[PDB]
Symmetry: D2
Subunit: 481 residues, 4 copies
Amino acid sequence: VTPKKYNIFLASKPVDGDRKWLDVTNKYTNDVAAKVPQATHKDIDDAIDAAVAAAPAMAAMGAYERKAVLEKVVAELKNRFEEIAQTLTMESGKPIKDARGEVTRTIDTFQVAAEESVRIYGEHIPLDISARNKGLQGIVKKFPIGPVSMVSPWNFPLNLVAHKVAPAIAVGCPFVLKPASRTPLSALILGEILHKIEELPLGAFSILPVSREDADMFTVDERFKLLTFTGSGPIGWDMKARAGKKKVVMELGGNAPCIVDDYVPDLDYTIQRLINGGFYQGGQSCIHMQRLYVHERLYDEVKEGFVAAVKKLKMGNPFEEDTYLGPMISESAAKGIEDWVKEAVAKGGKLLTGGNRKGAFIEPTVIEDVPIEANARKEEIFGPVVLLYKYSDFKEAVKECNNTHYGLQSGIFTKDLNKAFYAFEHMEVGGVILNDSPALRVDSQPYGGLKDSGIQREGVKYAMDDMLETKVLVMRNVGTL
Amino acid sequence: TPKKYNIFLASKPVDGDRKWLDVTNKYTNDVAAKVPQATHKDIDDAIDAAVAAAPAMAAMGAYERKAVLEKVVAELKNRFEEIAQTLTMESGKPIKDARGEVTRTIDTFQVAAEESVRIYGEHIPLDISARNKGLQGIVKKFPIGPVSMVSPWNFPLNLVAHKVAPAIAVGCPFVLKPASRTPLSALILGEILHKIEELPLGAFSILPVSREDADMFTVDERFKLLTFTGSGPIGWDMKARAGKKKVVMELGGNAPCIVDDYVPDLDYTIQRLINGGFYQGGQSCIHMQRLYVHERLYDEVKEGFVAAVKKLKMGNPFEEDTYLGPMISESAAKGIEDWVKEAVAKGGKLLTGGNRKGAFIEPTVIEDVPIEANARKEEIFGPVVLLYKYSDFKEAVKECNNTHYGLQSGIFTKDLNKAFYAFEHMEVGGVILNDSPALRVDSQPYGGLKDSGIQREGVKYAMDDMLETKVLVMRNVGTL
Amino acid sequence: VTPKKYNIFLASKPVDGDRKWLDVTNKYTNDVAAKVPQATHKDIDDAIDAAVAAAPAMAAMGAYERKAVLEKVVAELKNRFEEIAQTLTMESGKPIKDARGEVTRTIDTFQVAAEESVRIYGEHIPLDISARNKGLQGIVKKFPIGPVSMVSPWNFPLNLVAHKVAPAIAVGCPFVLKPASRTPLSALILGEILHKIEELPLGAFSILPVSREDADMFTVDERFKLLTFTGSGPIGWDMKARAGKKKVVMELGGNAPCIVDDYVPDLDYTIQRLINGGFYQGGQSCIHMQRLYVHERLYDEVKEGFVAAVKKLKMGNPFEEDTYLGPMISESAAKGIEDWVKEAVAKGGKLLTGGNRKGAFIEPTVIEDVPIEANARKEEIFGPVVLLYKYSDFKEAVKECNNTHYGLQSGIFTKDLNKAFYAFEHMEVGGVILNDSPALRVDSQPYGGLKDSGIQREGVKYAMDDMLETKVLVMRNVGTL
Amino acid sequence: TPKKYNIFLASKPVDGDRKWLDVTNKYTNDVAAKVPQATHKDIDDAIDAAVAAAPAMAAMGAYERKAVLEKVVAELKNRFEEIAQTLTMESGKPIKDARGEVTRTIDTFQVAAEESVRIYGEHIPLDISARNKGLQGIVKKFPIGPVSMVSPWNFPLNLVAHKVAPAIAVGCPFVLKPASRTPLSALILGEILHKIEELPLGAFSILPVSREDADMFTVDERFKLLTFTGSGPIGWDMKARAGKKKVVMELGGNAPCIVDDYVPDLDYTIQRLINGGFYQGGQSCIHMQRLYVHERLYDEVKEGFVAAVKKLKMGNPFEEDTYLGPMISESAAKGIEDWVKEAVAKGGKLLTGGNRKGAFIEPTVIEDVPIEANARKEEIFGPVVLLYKYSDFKEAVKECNNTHYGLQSGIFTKDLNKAFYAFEHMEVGGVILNDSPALRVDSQPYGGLKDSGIQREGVKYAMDDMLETKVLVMRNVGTL
């Protein structure tokens, strides 16, 4: 098996040469499936200088030119669909059905960005609000913030890249992207696509897998006006603390709960959505449903149906069409999950199903009554593990949903008008999912959270706002001859 | 001795040798006021003055428009009780309801004062394709120009405020035709406006008009907008004859309410149903005329509702504890009484009331009135509620829609899906959730579908109809 | 020359059968190039009944389904581009270069509508503005108005159809379209495209060229919730007067002026834009530059350059690639223009160039100092005629621009900040064109006018507003357990 | 005898045995006031009270938030002269400028009152693709929670109002650290707020703090937002140490102005340049520090500008005709004097002023100061204007941008393209057209690029940073 050689992108151009090689493994077989050049400190410096130099031409592009770039990306993603999905499954270990879903969502993200690029509206504001302000009016317009530092994760290596790259192009910001070293190929495929687009100025982008020795440049470099990070909370908060003067956007982890107070529209559909929330992407999602709170009257029926449905989930080769659950990103990630499951049961948790490790594979797991002191309850598991709880009081269930240091998304199943809006009002999250699990994300919704889950929002039009600066033209007696 | 009033022609109080209009006390029937009636020449002069004042109205600073509206707010607060007393006298509405109307008028003028300094425009990119390279636009809103206002007798202060406050907030001159039965509230606004120096001369006229000249408010080409609140047949005929001008119509209704639950409880549900069915004595375009109660709740609701209507105090509207005052006229009361008798003759079961005493109609509840009866198909505009039972929610929504009107509807439910199904399928401008359809917030978009009219009132929505869009398309502006 | 037989569209289906034929002539050769079935009174009744019956399924479509219809129209227009352009030139007489420009603009119109179909936003409003309103909030949402009556013109038979049809589909309104009898083929091509789109419910559309005896149904029929008309002012105002209860939108004629107070960026570019304004579409445009006001210091230079440039304009066969000016819609239209030119010169106007008729062809004409009483000055000429005037005072030039019973668009060439904004403030029009002639229209801009030019605005998002009804959900203590 | 003040802890006036801080009259240097200094325990208690008050703050009706802000407006109008006198005393700003600051503060609180009832959300379709069928969303904004506020000494009332008014308009509890040199303006707001019943207990604290405890306002994890106005090096260091919370920074500037024309005339242009160059004695973040005049206008502008500078009355700020008061301290004045001497030593030509008399600095104009001089390189925060000539407009814009600050810029032009070229290319938050960069409307988005900070103030923009977005994603809601 000869590993495929890829190029990295430095100031819009494919580079390889005698640079050191980064190995990319097939997450199922563990074989090196690809070799990618590793960027040097000088390459990163050159990338940042090129982004600064390309900022005026990026800012001078017509709205239709920014749109044409994004539409060309959409067309190339559709054309290379299966190839991109196969590469995604290979480097991330996610089942091929989920990989195809990610490519579809990436197409939607670039498509929303294409439409938004031609809709950056400004305001005409009256400023004569009092007599002392007579004859004043303003024009409020938004401008590109400038060069953007992007650091993306390994769990959605295409879609979570798209949620940074598509808004940057829609606005007219040059960028330097550091893809995750474990999954950089999805990002490099975008680089190949972007390289062939003539409308995009030279130096508008760089996509560089970087060593640990130079990774800090993406945090501290004063030439970037914005740092946008998606990944681990402790890493993210530390980057925000050391970023310097630049603006910071963070999309971090979660410990998403779901309340089941009714079956909506029925039990079968409720179970299917709970299975999706608890085990989609093998729990390797920042909005994975980690905690399930079921009302007393429904508890035995839900537990029975839920556990029976998790026992039917196909775990195996992610390249197979009928695989529901693929392996974890690494054997070390799987060992960590296994340790937390063992600890949860040692502390009093009742194992309902799964909990066993087979290399990088973790069986879909359900644990009942895990105490607050256990790591599986307190921290983001990021694995196919669901913590099942019973409740008698709705207000108390909402309070328990909030009993976490995370605040990304929450789910609620209810037929009750007041319970639905009480949950919207009191759940300490960025998004409340009504009659679906918290694992739901529309690529146009404001996505992000409170507490340790991060700062600001992604979702194309919201991510674009963070890449834009407000400027007002205050006009004194303009139109007076 | 009846009080003598002035009318307002080109911002100035006028009287002279004009024909006198009697304004009667709607309880005692005594002539309480004498009002000059405008001539054809006064209307012509009013329209010419509005056309002449349009440039100065359009040139006012946003803070000047605000100062006018804030001065109206301050004068309404200062003359509160006097205005409320005059309101009860000319409209017949109980003094508690009249005070409520003055409060809502203060809120309407206050919302307009805040909106006057918030007329935003857009900066739009216009380079949407290669052929449109180097193009950008500034979209700004401008006063439409002189506006013709025709107001009703049921809320002679607040339904005037909903036309006048947006016109001032935008910078439109106007000519107002108040209802001849209730012109005093409109005339008190004129008195206030007359004393405001910031408002250009000729910005307003308030003229009670004969029927031989009333058509000028419809057909005159100098008016850029006609805004009418009143009777549907009158309104639709005015729209047909308006000519080139834009037309805004706030017409009647036949508002239904679904009771599928008690929210939060039975007591509160009954109180809101009483308010909807009998507030302003049913003389409201959003009066709850039809009540649909689910079969499992029917007997309990009917019993509680009928017991509560039997406790309603009917009498002298000047008395603090009076709930139900008289109808606008004895003829209005006779008409309601005829429709009640016809409803019972066609199979309707009278649960309470139905009797007339001069201009007074007892609060009435009739069960199972057929679709052929006038009380069911047409707006009653009286203290009459039609009660019905249903077994299927979808069918109750379909029956709510079984009308040629479409103003507002009400729904009491604890069900998330029923609440949003009703929002989606009710053919109205406003769906009231866990209150009767008689609810209106002075900032909400208010108006309807079908025979209930066209467009919306509520200060910022009424302002939109008094504004014209203008775009400045800029080719390579900023290229040296 | 065998005329091509077309079908008409009745409740989404192509029909012909036992119907009478409408002749469609080549506006250059006068040959009958096409035969179109004429709809009977029963066909119109069936079309309206089908639109009423399709209204619930139109209103129940997902936003993405409305988008998919519009995107499929975009794809079919691109695929049949040259064929549509050739048909346009044939039935309208407009030069092939202008016909291609009209197909591109129609593609942009349907594309803007596709993007707008997924962006119909509502508001969440606080309603607790005072103590009496405690515990109130509202959700304001927009709903399809219902069946739409559409009456389109002959001067842009594809684009001015698109500006009614694309927003109706973007919103989810069924419609019955009456295309102009002289130019129905462009509308019938949209009908062919629409017929093949499975996402569009059966009966969502009808496209019927209608005889005079049944044309009134489009005005008075109570089953229509909105009438949208583009065409002749006297016809339009009379339809508004007799429409009954339905809402009315009107796009009528104009008598567009242009002020030349400077050369922006230079004389060459100014002359080229003034030529486009005065003679593009052969002046058969509602925003044709009919009146030209040039400052006295620039007058002789502008007149010389402008007259020299009109003398170079190629008039002839609209199928020729280098033809600038094609024939008028009819010989009667040309005779009418010729009469107004002769009347203008009889009343004191000085003919600078053109003014001669050759069948349906009118030479590009320029007349100096035409008095206010002449029809060429008072009314919309809708021909290749420009009325030239000199001015000394800018404020007076603006006042003279406004000295008309129309109010569609105006143009101003200026380097002066205050003159630019004074003109924006005081010109009594829907659109002020800055440093271009009034003949400029972007398919996304709010387009329409004041005075006799009509009521309301077209431009996709503005036309959509008129096809939408506001509904508020007033919520009392929702979220109180 | 110095006046004794109270500080505010969890909405309540406190004094006790706290260490006393002296507040001096900036003209006489006499101790005018004695202010308690908060302890570490007071700050802890203030933050705990703000966390405890956050649910009641978030549960207030929009009209209750409005009523608080309207009560502040009414109290500011009532105590106008007293507040203006206290402002001149503690800040040293001339009484005319102090009165203008109270006016601007009234406008800020008034804008906030109107904005408090206008926090709109969105109803969004979420069915953007087939996989998203049956999805819809409600996007609503929620208070971010407890706010840490750190205010400056240059506008101790208005720059406090720009943090406090949006916090109340939104429903955020807050802990304010006023500048220790000018706390009295902040303590008057506290006195006003203490008497407002609608405001929940613990909603606010106003605490003058020692350097030993000042870091709590930066690092404490109970605060959800840090909003700072002051010195750039201090601000950037606070952003670095803030932790997880959101950070808003309003820092200094080095504002330039281009004079390419006289708009509408020379007299008006000179008056605005004088206002820009010397209003608040240059002790403003938008003070016009650099003046670029086109070569054809240069001699005429220099002559008129220098002559007008020479007429400026410098003296006792309590006098009605004083234009220029003293600097905040003698040390501040000595620093400005050193930079003026350094500018002249490096080649700058002194056209007027440059002398120090205690805390007073004469209004100064220096021509051709090189880029290496501190007076050109850094924010002077004094009555000093750096005068330059240019021949090329594009080059003048480039030179305006030749700074590490980016708050505001000014441009005088009659040219449409120059106006919009400057709007496009000036690296600032606000471009002032036909006025100096010292212009600020209390409703405009105010803030900057580069070292001038992050985010925007101006009531509705400051409210945005105090709000968190929450979406309710609804799956098949309304399906029965």
